[PDB]
Structure formats: structure tokens, C-alpha cells
UniProtKB/Swiss-Prot annotation, chain A:
<dbReference type="GO" id="GO:0015810">
    <property type="term" value="P:aspartate transmembrane transport"/>
</dbReference>
<keyword id="KW-0221">Differentiation</keyword>
<keyword id="KW-0406">Ion transport</keyword>
<dbReference type="GO" id="GO:0007283">
    <property type="term" value="P:spermatogenesis"/>
</dbReference>
<dbReference type="GO" id="GO:0034214">
    <property type="term" value="P:protein hexamerization"/>
</dbReference>
<feature type="disulfide bond">
    <location>
        <begin position="76"/>
        <end position="204"/>
    </location>
</feature>
<dbReference type="Pfam" id="PF13855">
    <property type="entry name" value="LRR_8"/>
</dbReference>
<keyword id="KW-0433">Leucine-rich repeat</keyword>
<keyword id="KW-0472">Membrane</keyword>
From Swiss-Prot, chain B:
<dbReference type="InterPro" id="IPR001611">
    <property type="entry name" value="Leu-rich_rpt"/>
</dbReference>
<dbReference type="GO" id="GO:0098656">
    <property type="term" value="P:monoatomic anion transmembrane transport"/>
</dbReference>
<feature type="repeat" description="LRR 9">
    <location>
        <begin position="498"/>
        <end position="521"/>
    </location>
</feature>
<dbReference type="GO" id="GO:0015810">
    <property type="term" value="P:aspartate transmembrane transport"/>
</dbReference>
<keyword id="KW-1015">Disulfide bond</keyword>
<feature type="disulfide bond">
    <location>
        <begin position="76"/>
        <end position="203"/>
    </location>
</feature>
<comment type="similarity">
    <text>Belongs to the LRRC8 family.</text>
</comment>
<feature type="disulfide bond">
    <location>
        <begin position="40"/>
        <end position="218"/>
    </location>
</feature>
<dbReference type="GO" id="GO:0007283">
    <property type="term" value="P:spermatogenesis"/>
</dbReference>
Length: 717, 716
């Protein structure tokens, strides 16, 4: 049935020859069972046990009964008739049974039968698959059809590992063919030698003279000529069977069937990655070629991994649809429409169809080739290639050079960094993450930064020990340089004096423990955040007064244990974020900077909060969370511009009613502390609401019911 | 099973005759095996090995036992009965098996069996395909279109794999010849030996030593029955001959390896059905022999016109209105444009969407614009690029009252359409492609005379001479543009006839000699002479004849000096003269006060002339890439400097007079060699970076509040 594909012309020929030979066996067997007799007539005159062969003719009277004649027939049939004439049909039937068993042994042996059935199934359902037609012919595919196509691909993938290792089917077919050919040789020897013994006239000399009276009888075998022509027909059929088996043996010898080359298939078709198959898989593929080569032509489609990549791309273009991706679109801190592609095989075309995209996140996309359809991403300005090597061509390169402006490349290898990122004209923001210190590549791969003249932001989370000179030549046009070294001292040597255009030097985790002179040598820095620079004593702040541009000096995450009075020189400061430190106290002279608008002192060791806070009339958010302030001074409430009061987790005994003076206060952190009760004057603040007033439920319930209702109504609306 | 459609009447008849022959073979075989005996009686009167054949009658005593009689029977049956009378049923069985093997070796040989199975599967799938019914009719579902396209590719691949050789036809021929030869041999030998099946047979076997008699006469009881069988068999073989012989004639009267679809292509709509050959032709001939409808409706899957119709229908369903609405963009005039790029046909869904205005169909072949475009409301532009358009008459009527502009790109006469002239209410007829073809010197455009509403006609076709038909048609023209892209036009002063013309343009004609027929026309307001490479314009003393020109456009020329007379035209409002070879330009050029747009980029001028200071109505200038280091106080006598182009230049000094110009719209200053940039770029919300692209090398040393204004430009 299903194995007709695996039976070539020689197998069909041998099967039909075996059927005809079995018919001969059955016919001869029935004849030899029913009508096989031996009519024997005694010789009247004998000479030394041999018939002498010595007025109308009269019959010879033998004086023998019918039963004596039957006895003579039985004795001479048993004794003198040759064994070949008696057992020709049974020997023929035995030979046909042996031939049929040899031909069908590999269809019944479970070890080869399992492989044969698996091969037949995964080649036939391969044959009727539509993916074969679509691939050999070379947008949208049916969901069931695509799932089936990938299922048969995986099934072929496991079948190749399950069969190619072994050669049991090939060896079994070899052994069956060899046994059949030697059986044919034995038959065509013995049958031809003994076929001449099927004679009509047989002399019998059986010595039954004491029971019959005669010794020699001239018998006659009736089915001798018919058995002779049956034997001749059987010999002819065995000759044909043997010639066919020798052709099969010669076919198996000349061409190595333990190898199969798809060279003809891979040249006619575009797919040239079809591998050369070997062993049993090669053998049954050769058999299928003997049946019909176009079956293997279609079967070679699933053997090429280029077809796998095409099918995976098409299925990804279907699995990720434009609709689901419209929901996938989110927004970042910069309020930019963005989609995060995590573990994707490539970029779906549905992703590139999107035109409102601002930030495309190619994160962990294995070796994806960027197609020119990125030109559809007209709004595309931000690409974050996170461990994603981007393969690109000329039109997509031109579109990115003319459109793309910010590029945050995160890599773990030099090869992960693409070389085309240095050819973009409009790039202005560039972020690197990953160690850059290497042999014969230290600050040489980025030598293409000179081509990039629009670069303004250069973040290097590269654990680098020194700033590269190419970045120093770039710094003529660079306005922002943030270095992250993760606790590695960067060798300054006052080498940052070249970047006179630098505006925001954010040394993140640089572990400098000192301020080099290059920080206050350049005149263009407004914001200098020495995050985790581990500066013990903040002593270089006198020279920062020449920095008229400096308005944001964030000295957080340091061992500053005391603030010298000298900071009173710097009157231009606004966003002094001095949090997460061990400041024993901020002094009165610290409040000499009346321009301070944003002041962060959270997670500090303050003794208290002084009165000169009344000087800072521009203060908006004062943050002393988890510091040591026992009582809130009224001078804190003297200022009216407070907006975000991070006062939680403190030892504030009580909040004075003077908070009712505050109107700009839209949020105040009051959770924890030693707060006895919340004053009713908190309801006087218009901008404050429930989300703004974060406090424990019981302390909030200490307020009168109606003012709480007012706050609730102002909150929900 | 499924091979009945491949078995004609001769094959069925031969199969049934073989069945009957097998039946008589089995019957005769059972008779011969069981009841075939030979009753032999001795001839007591022997006369030279012959039966002499010579008082109540009494039976003759032969003195023979029953076993002697059986021995005589066996010997005279073995030796003296004819071999035909003994082996007639076995020979008939062998012949029937040979005939059956010849008939079924077609379906048992794996190559031809696979080919026939593949053909049967494909033809049955096409028979049950619904599109063929529609193909015989002339909606469709997405699934039906998908499966019909897949069946089209399957049919193409099957034709490619089968039409290569004729193994099936050769096998059928060989089987037919073998059957005919077997019939001939069977008839000859059976007719010759049928007379040997006789009832009474005389046997002389020489068993006198065992029996006592020499000659015996035997009766073969079954012989007559075998004779009645044998003649019957002969009759069947006779039939099996003639039918088979007819097959041979049917296989030799006409070449079965060439199937002609002439009848099907002439009855059905599709007349492009190709004539298949070899095995395909043979199986299609056999299938016609079964039923012509199978091949008739299989012919639609071989015709390319059916594939084109199927692809058009699939484009109708594939291109949804939702996807089309995504493809609609907006052009310069804020008008909704659809860019149809590399579509094999034109979707009816394109004409479904009424929001379209500009229909750009580019390199779209086999175009037959359906009048469903009448349902489209906003269509005033249709952009035919490299397209052989064939519109319908109701669509002709609709576009005669609705379409208002038309751009045509083509390759000579091949893609020029004919319906464009029948539309006589259009305004804009833009022609692209080489109209300067061989042997068709302005004879195709001879049908433009009937157009009386045409007022805008842009001619960019590398014309050699002005067509006389254009002179005839122009009487109702208003706008004309001439682009030759590197060819010297032969005008020959034929513009004196055509007086109504308001706008005339001449781009890159390489003339150097401005013609005289312009001065007879007093209606030209906009004259464009870009890249004409003038060097001494003694024509603007002759342009004083023309008092209608409002803006001269002489930019990207090589003017050595501009002659002073143009200073007398106060109506001049636009001085486009950038990228020139100007060494010195005297003053009296600039006597005109009311010039708005000027461009002087990429020159060699050492100082901008003083009497530009007389120009008080400026909007744009340029000092790009030259040898000017300062802005003169004469330029400061002007008060309307909005735009400039001073980039990649050597300007050093920036006084407060130019800097206080708040309305500075777009001045190129990138790459300029300034010394320092002033703090006057700080406060005001009008003059900022997206307006003024000042030098970014000194924009770094500019104060951060200046940078605040400029980055505010990039935001606001
Ligand atoms: C001559 C018989 O001669 P004897 O009986 O020796 O005496 C001659 C007869 N006058 O035999 C022949 O000519 C052979 C021709 C018969 C061929 C028929 C073959 C039969 C094949 C059996 C197929 C079995 C399928 C079941």
C-alpha cells in the first residue's frame, strides 16, 4: 500500500514473478495430490531382471487382481519414480516462500520497518505540503499551513539525526539481494540438472515377486510431460527472477548507495545549502529516485536551512501582526513611542510597516539583516542595538545616515559593534556599554568618530581606564560626555581640557575620590554630577565660581562628611543634589546660595535643619528623607515655593500648622516618622491631594471627616 | 479505481474480452485436469498398422485387464493425442495472462505509473476546482483564490515535469504493437491447429509386449467440447484483434504527441491556451477520448489570460481599503495622493476609496482602467507612468467631467495612450518620455487639434523643433514649459502667432542667444532662463520692449558682467543669479528697488556692489563661498534682509546693524570663518536656530541662554 513508493521496477517484477511461480506451485500441488498415479504393467518374459520384449492378436493375461495392480503402482511410485517428479511442486512452493520472505523481510523486521514507515510518512506528507510548491515556485500564509510546515521541518530535522547514523536498511537490502541471487543460482543448478528425470516411461524393479508374481514392471507416469512443461516454465521464471536480481545487485554495487548528492537539486533550485545525505537515508532516497525523482525533488526543500530561514521570517511576519504591535507600542522617559523586540528571530515586516515609531529596540535579535524597508520608519530616530549585530545594505544605510540621530549600542564584543555606525551623518547621541580595553583595538575601532561631526552625547559605560584621544578630537563638537567605569579610576591627567564644548560631565561610578583640575578648567559645564565618585572632601568648589554656566552640582553618593563654608562662593547653584551621603550637617553658609531651587539631602546624617533655609525663597523640593531631624523649623515654612516635601522616614515629632501657608505643595511624603497627628491646615493647601499626601491610613483618618471628604473630592473628580 | 478516466472504450472492451478468455481458460483447465480421458479399444483386425474395421451378436472378447486398458489409455493419450487437444486451455490461459500483462504494464511500471497518478490527481483537482466554472462563465473567496493560484503553480510544475518526454506514449504504443502481434500469432496457430481436436483418434504406440495389440482406436470425450471452446476462443481473439487494430489506427491517424486546444480556445473566452506536446498531449487525447469536458475545463489552467484574471481578482481581495488608506499620503498641495508602485494590475479597491486625489500608477502594465473610478470623488490627478492605458467609455464620460490634470510618461508610441485626446476638458497635460522618435516627426500629436480647453502644457520630451500642431493648438494655451535636457531647440521664431501665453520657461537649452519672437508677446509674467549660460546680456536692453515680465530667473549661468539696463525695470522682483562666474558687476544693475528674492551663492565677487544698498524690498541674498570678508554699510542701508546664504565663507566682522535684523528668516552660515559670535542671539523669540543656522563652531562658545533660544527654535 504505502510502500509502493519504496518498490522499484525490479521489486514489482520479482513480486509478480513470485505470484506466477506460486500459482505454478499450487497447480502442481493440486495435480500431484489428486491425479498423480503410476500405471504399471508387468513384463511377462524377463532375462536377468530385464524385460525380454519377446490368428488375430489376443490380450496378455497377467492373472493380477485390481488390488495387486494398485500395490504394484504404490511400490514403484514410492521406490523407482524419481524424487524430483514427486516433490517438484513442493520444492517450487518452498522456493517461492523463501523468495517472498526475502523480498518482504525488511517490511516486517521492526528495526527497519519503523524507519521505513517514518520515511514514507514524512516524505508523502512532505510531498503534498504546500510549502514545497511555494518554495519550488521561487506574503501571507495560513496559520494551520504555517504550523504544519514548521512541524514537518522539525520532523525532518529529527529524522535526519535518527536515520543517517545507521545503515541497517541498506545492509538488510544487500543481504536480501545476495540471498536471493544465491538461491536463484542453487535453483537453476539443481532444477536444470534433475529436470531430465521426469520421464513418461519408467522401468521399476522392486522385488515383490512373493506378493504379485512378477519382478519388473514397465510403469507409466501420466503427469510427466505436464510436469516437464511446468518445470520448464518454472526454470524460465527463475531465470527471469535471477536476471532481475543480478541487475539489482549490479545497481547496488556500481553506485555507492551510502551517499546521496543533491547537486542536481541545489543547482536547478535557488536553495544551494541542501547537504549531501549518507547511509540509510541516502539509500531510501535512491530508492525513491528509482520510483520517481520528483518526490525527492520536493523532499530536498525541507533539508535546506535557507528554506528554514525563509519560513521562519514568513511565520514571524504572521505571528507578530501590525495590530498586536500597535498595542506593543509603549513610551519611554523621553515620552517617545517605542517597541521592545525581545527574543525575536528577526525584525517582522509588520514592525517596519509602522510609521509613527520613534525608538526601535533591537535587543538580542540574532544577527538580523536590516532590509531597506526601514525607510518606511520615517520617524525613526532612536535605535538601541542591545547585543544585536545589525547587517545593513546601501539604501537602508542612506536612510539611517539621513534620518537617524541617536544610537545606544550595547555590546560584549568588538565584532558586535557594527562598522557602519561610524558612517552616520546626523548621529548626535551615542551610548556604549561593554568593556573596551583590548589588544590592538584600544581606541582604534572608534577612529571613525571623526567622520561623525554632529555627535553631542557620548556615554561610555566601557570600564575604560583613560579617555581616548579620538574622543578628545570629537570633543570640539561634543557637548555631553558621561563616563561609567564601575569603580575603576580613570586616568585623567587633565586630558579633558580639549573638550571646551563639554556641557554635562557626568562621571558615573568613576571612583575618582578627587576632583581633577580639568573639571573646572573648561568653562562650559552647567551640570556636573559626580555620581559615586567617592570624594571624601569636597574642596575644589572654590574654582567652580568661574563656571558661570554651572547651575547643577550634584554631589551625591560620596563620603563627604562635612560641608566647608567655602561653597557660599557658588551663588549660581540651583539643583544641588547632595543626597545619600554622610553629611553631619548642612551649615548656614550653605544657604548663602539663594538661587538654590532644587535641594536634595536624602539619606544623610544631618543633626537638624537650620533656620537660614528661610533665605532659599526659590526652593521647590527639599528632600531630607531618612535623615535625623527632630523638629521642623518654622523658617522652613517661611518659604512659600515648596512643592515636593520628601519628609518621610524621619524623627519629626510633629508637623507644624504653618504648612497651611504652603500653596505650591502638590505632594509631601509624610509616611513613617514620629508624626503624632496631621494638622487640619494641610487641608488649606489647594494643590495637595491624596496621591500627593502619602501617609499612613490611621494618621490620615485622624483628620476631621469633612476635610477628608474635600480632599477625596478634589482627588477623584 | 481512479484510472477509469484513462481507459477508453477499446481498453474496457479488451479488459472484458480478457475476462471472458480467462473464464474459458479456467473452465477448460478444470475440464482437462479432471475429466479429460481417452477411451481406447484395441483393433482386433490389424492390417498393416491400420484398423481393418471388419446367430445373435456377441461382444468381442479382448482378454485385457482394466489396468491394461488404463495403460493403453495413458500411452495413446501421451503419444498420439495432439498437443493442441491436451494444452489448449493452458495456452489460452498463457495468452490471456500475456494480454493482461500488456494491458496493465502501463500502470505497473513505476515511472509511467507515477506520471499517470500525478496527471490523474492534477486533472481531478482542476475538475473539482471552482474557478474553472468561473473560467467557463467569463465572487471568489480568499481561500478559493489561494487554492486556485496554488493549483495554477501545480499545473505549471506538472507540465514542466511531464512535457519533457513521451515515456507514457511510447509505452502505450509498444503495448499496442505487442498485443496486435500476439493476436496475429494466436490467430494463425490456433486456426491452423484447431482441426486436430478430433473425437476418434487412431493410435499405434507399439505396446504389443505389454498388451498384445498394436493399433487401437480411441475416443476423446471432451474433444468436441474443446472444439466448441476453441472456435469460441478464436472468435474472442478475432474481436480482441479488431479492437486492438482500431487502436493502432487511432494511434497512427494523427500525431498523439501534439494536442491542439483550437476548439477550446475558440469557444471559451481564453484564446491564448498553448498547444501541449509529448506525454501531456497523449494523456489529454486519452482524456478527450473518455470525455471532452475534462480537457475543455482543464484548458483554463493552461491559459495565461486566466492566470492574469485570477491575479487581478486576488489583488482585488488582497488590497483591502484599510491597507490602501495606510498608503495614502499628502502631496505639496495638501492633496491626497496614492502611489501605486509596481502593481501587476489596478485594484478596484483603489477606485473604491473616494478620498483619493492624485492617482500615481507607475510602470503598471496591462492597464484597463475600470469605470468604478467614477465612484471615486476627489480624482483630479492621474499620473500615468510607462503605462499602456485602455479606459472604458463610461469611464471616458466620467473623466471628461471630473479629471482636471494628467501626467503621461512613456517610451515612444508603445506606452502613449489613445483615450487622452478624447478627454477635452482637462487643464494639465504633462508628457514625459522620448517623443523625438524615428519616422514619426510630430505626426502622433496631430490629433491634439480638437483640444480647445488645454491651457497648461509642459513639454519635456527632447523635442528637436517646435511642432506646427502645437502652434495650431496653443491659441487657447496659458502655461507652457520647455525642457530639452541637453538639446539645442530650433525655435525659428514661430511664437509671433500665439499671443495669449502668460508663463514661458526655458531650462538648460544651451542657447546663449535669446530669441526675438518673445517681444511680440505682451503677456509673459514669469520667464525662467535657468542654466542658459549668458555672458553679456545685451538682451535686457531689448527686454525693455517687454513690459510684463515680473520675475527674471537667470540662475546657474556664467554671467561675466550683467549689463546695466536691467536697472530700469522696477517691476522686477526676483534676481536668481547663484553659482555664477561673476568677477565684477557694476552698480546701475541695482536701480530697481523692489526685488525680494536674490541668490548669489558660490561666486568670485570681492565686494557686493554699493547700489544694492538702493534695494529696500529684499527677502533673500547669498554670499556663499567667495572672497567677501565683511558686510558693507551699503547693505546696511537696506532694511529688509530676511534670508541669506553666507555659509562656508570668509565673513569676519559682524556689526550690530545686521544682527539687529529680527525678521532674519533663513541665513546659511555653517562653515563661515567668523571670529566670535555675539550675545545678541539670546532673548528674542523670533530669530533662532531653525531660522538662522549660524556657525556651530562658535555656537559652542555662545552663552547657554543663546543656546536656549536656538534649541527653542528646534523645539518651537
Ligand atoms: C508437446 C507434447 O508432446 P508429448 O505429449 O511428448 O507427445 C507429442 C503429442 N503428439 O508439448 C509441447 O509442444 C508443449 C506446448 C504446450 C505449451 C503450454 C504451456 C503450459 C504452461 C502451464 C502454465 C501454468 C499456469 C497455471
Amino acid at each position: 500500500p504505502a510502500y509502493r513508493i519504496l518498490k522499484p521496477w525490479w521489486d514489482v517484477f520479482t513480486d509478480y514473478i513470485s505470484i506466477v511461480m506460486l500459482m505454478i506451485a499450487v497447480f502442481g500441488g493440486t495435480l500431484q495430490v489428486d491425479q498423480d498415479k503410476m500405471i504399471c504393467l508387468p513384463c511377462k518374459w524377463v532375462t536377468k531382471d530385464s524385460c525380454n520384449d519377446s490368428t488375430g492378436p489376443t490380450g496378455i493375461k497377467y492373472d493380477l487382481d485390481r488390488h495387486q495392480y494398485n500395490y504394484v503402482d504404490a511400490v514403484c511410485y514410492e521406490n523407482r519414480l524419481h524424487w524430483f517428479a514427486k516433490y517438484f511442486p513442493y520444492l517450487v512452493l518452498l522456493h517461492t516462500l523463501i523468495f517472498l520472505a526475502c523480498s518482504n523481510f525488511w517490511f516486517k523486521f521492526p528495526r527497519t520497518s519503523s524507519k521505513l514507515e517514518h520515511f514514507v510518512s514524512i516524505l508523502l506528507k512532505c510531498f503534498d505540503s504546500p510549502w514545497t510548491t511555494r518554495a519550488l515556485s521561487e506574503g501571507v500564509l495560513d496559520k494551520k499551513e504555517g504550523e504544519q510546515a514548521k512541524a514537518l521541518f522539525e520532523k525532518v530535522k529529527k529524522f535526519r539525526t535518527h536515520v543517517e547514523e545507521g545503515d541497517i536498511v541498506y545492509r538488510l537490502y544487500m543481504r536480501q539481494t545476495i540471498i536471493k541471487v544465491i538461491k536463484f543460482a542453487l535453483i537453476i543448478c539443481y532444477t536444470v540438472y534433475y529436470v531430465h528425470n521426469i520421464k513418461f516411461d519408467v522401468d521399476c524393479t522392486v522385488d515383490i515377486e512373493s506378493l504379485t508374481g512378477y519382478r519388473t514392471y514397465r510403469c507409466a507416469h501420466p503427469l510427466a510431460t505436464l510436469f516437464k512443461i511446468l518445470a520448464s516454465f518454472y526454470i524460465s521464471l527463475v531465470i527471469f527472477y535471477g536476471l532481475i536480481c543480478m541487475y539489482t545487485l549490479w545497481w547496488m554495487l556500481r553506485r555507492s548507495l551510502k551517499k546521496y548528492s543533491f547537486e542536481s537539486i541545489r543547482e536547478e533550485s535557488s536553495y544551494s545549502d541542501i547537504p549531501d545525505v549518507k547511509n540509510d537515508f541516502a539509500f531510501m532516497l535512491h530508492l525513491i529516485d528509482q520510483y520517481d525523482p520528483l518526490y525527492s525533488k520536493r523532499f530536498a526543500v525541507f533539508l535546506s536551512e535557507v528554506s528554514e530561514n525563509k519560513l521562519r521570517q514568513l511565520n514571524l511576519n504572521n505571528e507578530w501582526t501590525l495590530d498586536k504591535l500597535r498595542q506593543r507600542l509603549t513610551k519611554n522617559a523621553q515620552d517617545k513611542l517605542e517597541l521592545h523586540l525581545f527574543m525575536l528571530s528577526g525584525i517582522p515586516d509588520t514592525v517596519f510597516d509602522l510609521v509613527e515609531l520613534e525608538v526601535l529596540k533591537l535587543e538580542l535579535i540574532p544577527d538580523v539583516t536590516i532590509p531597506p524597508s526601514i525607510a518606511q520608519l520615517t520617524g525613526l530616530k532612536e535605535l538601541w542595538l542591545y547585543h544585536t549585530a545589525a547587517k545593513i545594505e546601501a539604501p537602508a544605510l542612506a536612510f539611517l545616515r539621513e534620518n537617524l540621530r541617536a544610537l545606544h549600542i550595547k555590546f560584549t564584543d568588538i565584532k558586535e559593534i557594527p562598522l557602519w555606525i561610524y558612517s552616520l551623518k546626523t548621529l548626535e547621541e551615542l551610548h556604549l556599554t561593554g568593556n573596551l580595553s583590548a589588544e590592538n583595538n584600544r581606541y582604534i575601532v572608534i577612529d571613525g568618530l571623526r567622520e561623525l561631526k554632529r555627535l553631542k552625547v557620548l556615554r561610555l559605560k566601557s570600564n575604560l581606564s583613560k579617555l581616548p584621544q579620538v574622543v578628545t578630537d570629537v570633543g570640539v563638537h561634543l557637548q555631553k560626555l558621561s563616563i561609567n567605569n564601575e569603580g575603576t579610576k580613570l586616568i585623567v591627567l587633565n586630558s579633558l581640557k580639549k573638550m571646551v564644548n563639554l556641557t554635562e560631565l557626568e562621571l558615573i561610578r568613576c571612583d575618582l575620590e578627587r576632583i581633577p583640575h580639568s573639571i573646572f578648567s573648561l568653562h562650559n559645564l552647567q551640570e556636573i554630577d559626580l555620581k559615586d565618585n567617592n570624594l571624601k572632601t569636597i574642596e575644589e568648589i572654590i574654582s567652580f565660581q568661574h563656571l558661570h554656566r554651572l547651575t547643577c552640582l550634584k554631589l551625591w553618593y560620596n563620603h563627604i562628611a562635612y560641608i566647608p563654608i567655602q561653597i557660599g562662593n557658588l551663588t549660581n547653584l540651583e539643583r544641588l543634589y547632595l543626597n545619600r551621603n554622610k553629611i553631619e550637617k548642612i551649615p548656614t553658609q550653605l544657604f548663602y546660595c539663594r538661587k538654590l531651587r532644587y535641594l536634595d539631602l536624602s539619606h544623610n546624617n544631618l543633626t537638624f535643619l537650620p533656620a537660614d533655609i528661610g533665605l532659599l525663597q526659590n526652593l521647590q523640593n527639599l528632600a531630607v528623607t531618612a535623615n535625623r531631624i527632630e523638629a521642623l523649623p518654622p523658617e522652613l515654612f517661611q518659604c512659600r515655593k515648596l512643592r515636593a516635601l520628601h519628609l518621610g522616614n524621619n524623627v519629626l515629632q510633629s508637623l507644624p500648622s504653618r504648612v497651611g501657608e504652603l500653596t505650591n505643595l502638590t505632594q509631601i511624603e509624610l509616611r513613617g516618622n514620629r508624626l503624632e497627628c496631621l494638622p487640619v491646615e494641610l487641608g488649606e493647601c489647594p494643590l495637595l491631594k491624596r496621591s500627593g499626601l502619602v501617609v499612613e491610613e490611621d494618621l490620615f483618618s485622624t483628620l476631621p471627616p469633612e476635610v477628608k471628604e474635600r480632599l477625596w473630592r478634589a482627588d477623584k473628580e
